[PDB]
């Protein structure tokens, strides 16, 4: 528990930053501000409050091993890391989306999105997964029924997650598994264009001059997300489904392995020469 | 004092309330560049896809075109041409039955047409914009091969060693004499596409006469795989 | 034809030596300098854009 | 008759030479340097929904008028940033405009080969056409007004020309280019003018005699850009070959050149301070630089654009710069 702290520092530190710089890198420049980078921003914005407010009081936690704040705090941090994560999956989602309407129909890709639209989509998942988190936790819907939940929601100086079964399902359902379905077939149909496009220039001029360009990005940009927040979203359905199967310690781990997932984005939404030049000047 | 200072807010408010109506038209509508050597047969095509400056509008699957062809005005140095470069295609029409005939004394025409595509595809303007070939004249040349005292050979060299190539699509009534005279022609003006293309824009060339009613389908086709090419190399599927 | 007389027309030009020339122009310049609001910044108060 | 002419060329190249007595360089030595200017933007007008090609101020420092290829000619009011009036045109290729200098009228043209005047001050109307000056062969590159009355343009046909408003005729033209006109500038009294072509030549033309003067043959590209000294007995080019030179008319032959090694772009705009000792230049490269006059010593730099600038212009009060860019932005300077 020695180089553990600094580990989980520079993990903050590294989050914080990387959000921050692309925050002013979008607000500050007009050439950046197109209808796709207003998705972009929000997942930004979700991810820099995920990494101030939620990583920090957990490591504490996890290093005292004991809570020291109140009931109150600690039901407000656990919201706010039910809000925090919902919010930043389904913003991935809603960038597929884009991306599949772009290339698919091109001629109707101008029309059919408007900054008008694409602010009532922001507000509409903002406002479901504020519906998520926030309601269900402060009216107490999900607490269990055993007598270690009682013991430990009666002290100040237990912090721990206990839910029943439909609760625990019915999160998981609305946060991770709907938009992945989405996501896999969008992406499955971008590819199918793609190649069926680089086969005309084949079949055309091939004499003169595969797919290993969509395969890699398609690879990273799915493969990242998958290997990120797909173990957790499995244990979190079986160690309520059949109890006495998964360690805590587990439990955590792949909670945290979930959570620094918010550190990768920036490396993959915003490798565009534009945001490079744009980071370049600051 | 305030008394004009209303008026002004409410003027300004009503440019910009006008200027929002007009930007949402204007950003929905697709701009073409015809372009074409002497007697190529452009005023043809132009009339047909309609049923100073010469400007069409025509409309195809709910899609708002613009079409408009340049004076020539004499020009051989093109001053006017850094404008175009936000169109989103241009259209070549080159007649493939005039490689006999000489422009008082230069090359042939089909030589001509050449110098002026390699000049047009290396500008420092229109380094982004691609291009459509029509290869007009079609039945002309038939004929020329099919009887006549000219061959290919004696006004081009490199026919002598030029073969059919295997992907090729002759019409059913096509002699095969014609089949390889319309290719030879066709991947002259590939050669010099290929080379210089920095995978930002490309060549789509076809076969045209001035008989045919596809020709408006062929630039909605086109037209559609250039967009869809263009976002497919921004996110960098392509 | 034309060429040559109009050429015949400009070669009789009176003409001046250049240190007259240079002399005029930055004495113009040396005398206009003081009235120059992007030469010399004007007062923030008196500029109207700011 | 080709010898004669070789022979007038020699005379005409022989006599230039043998009136250099010294150069400006050597005069203005002990001139104290000008320093470093620095302009930060004041204002930012938007609106347009393409590339901007032209610019004017008006008499009156406050209004002035631009010009985009998306069919739009709005006036603005630079003191509040409030958008006056907005012209719809018949062509959506344009590349000149004019404000005249009572500021009733405004000109207008480019591709179409025609020239059209709009009435801005109607009783119990809007803005219409008065009139379109037709009969030029090629495309527009400039004009200018003289008078509520006449106005001057040049095109691509190798020609200028002067109209009469009123009637709709040419009262004079002007010949002797071998190449397309590129721009043009009138005197302060307006009793003579510049043109530059194509053909790496600069002429001073005569408007009531209507015949040429003097040609100048120092560039070595062809010619983007003229302007007229606040005095009114020299000029400065701007050409393709990132280089500018100033000229002198009684002289006969240029007196200085403004060029740097960093800089390999051509110049598409040049303009005068109201000294006389600033000159500012636009680039290809998406930003300005300003060259002092006397000592030809770069003195600051305005890089404020994201595109490549086609115009600039200073107030006639010189209290302002005014540039404009192909990503629909205007911008003050100072
Ligand atoms: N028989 C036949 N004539 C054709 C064909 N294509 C073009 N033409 C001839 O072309 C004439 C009109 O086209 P052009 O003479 O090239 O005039 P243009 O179309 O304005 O071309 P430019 O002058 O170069 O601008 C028609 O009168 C036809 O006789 C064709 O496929 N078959
Ligand atoms: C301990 N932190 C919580 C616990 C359960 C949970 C999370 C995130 C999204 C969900 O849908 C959940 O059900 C985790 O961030």
Known sequence: VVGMGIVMSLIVLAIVFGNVLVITAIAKFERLQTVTNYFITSLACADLVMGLAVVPFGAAHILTKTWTFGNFWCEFWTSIDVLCVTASIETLCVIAVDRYFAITSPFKYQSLLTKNKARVIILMVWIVSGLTSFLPIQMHWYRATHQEAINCYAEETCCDFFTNQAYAIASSIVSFYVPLVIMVFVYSRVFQEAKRQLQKIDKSEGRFHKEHKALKTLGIIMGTFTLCWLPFFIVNIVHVIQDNLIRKEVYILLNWIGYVNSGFNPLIYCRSPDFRIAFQEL | QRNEEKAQREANKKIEKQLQKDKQVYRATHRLLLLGAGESGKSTIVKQMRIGIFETKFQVDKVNFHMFDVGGQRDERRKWIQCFNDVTAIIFVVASSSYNMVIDNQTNRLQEALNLFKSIWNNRWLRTISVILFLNKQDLLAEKVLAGKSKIEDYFPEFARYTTPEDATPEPGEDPRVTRAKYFIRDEFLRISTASGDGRHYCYPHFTCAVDTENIRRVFNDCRDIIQRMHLRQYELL | RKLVEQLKMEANIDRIKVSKAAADLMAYCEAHAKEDPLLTPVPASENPFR | ?334
């Not at chain 4, 009114?232 to 032959?253: E, K, P, Y």
């Not at chain 4, 005068?272 to 010593?297: I, P, Q, T």
């Open chain 4, 1 to 334: 008759l080709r010898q004669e002419a070789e022979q007038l060329k020699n005379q005409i190249r022989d006599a230039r030479k043998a009136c250099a007595d010294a150069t400006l360089s050597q005069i203005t030595n002990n001139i104290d340097p000008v320093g470093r200017i620095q302009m930060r933007t004041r204002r930012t007008l938007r609106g347009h929904l393409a590339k901007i090609y032209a610019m004017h101020w008006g008499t009156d420092s406050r209004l002035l008028v631009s010009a985009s290829q998306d069919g739009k000619l709005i006036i603005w009011d630079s003191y509040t940033t409030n958008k006056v009036h907005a012209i719809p045109l018949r062509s959506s290729w344009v590349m000149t405009c004019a404000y005249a200098p009572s500021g009733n009228y405004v000109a207008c043209g480019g591709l179409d080969n025609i020239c059209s005047i709009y009435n801005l001050k109607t009783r119990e109307g809007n803005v219409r056409v008065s009139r379109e000056l037709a009969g030029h062969t090629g495309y527009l590159s400039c004009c200018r007004f003289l008078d509520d009355n006449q106005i001057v343009t040049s095109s691509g046909d190798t020609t200028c020309a002067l109209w009469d408003i009123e009637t709709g005729q040419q009262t004079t033209t002007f010949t002797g280019h071998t190449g397309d006109v590129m721009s043009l500038s009138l005197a302060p009294d307006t009793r003579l003018f510049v043109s530059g072509a194509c053909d790496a030549s600069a002429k001073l033309w005569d408007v009531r005699e209507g015949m040429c003067r003097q040609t100048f043959t120092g560039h070595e590209s062809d010619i983007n850009a003229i302007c007229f000294f606040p005095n009114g007995n020299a000029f400065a080019t701007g050409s393709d070959d990132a280089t500018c030179r100033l000229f002198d008319l009684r002289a006969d032959q240029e007196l200085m050149t403004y060029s740097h090694d960093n800089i390999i772009c051509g110049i598409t705009s040049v303009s005068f301070s109201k000294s006389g000792r600033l000159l500012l230049a636009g680039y290809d490269d998406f930003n300005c630089n300003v060259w002092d006059a006397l000592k030809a010593d770069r003195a600051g730099v305005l890089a404020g654009h994201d595109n490549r600038v086609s115009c600039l212009g200073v107030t006639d009060d010189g209290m302002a710069v005014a540039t404009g860019s192909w990503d629909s932005f205007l911008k003050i300077w100072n």
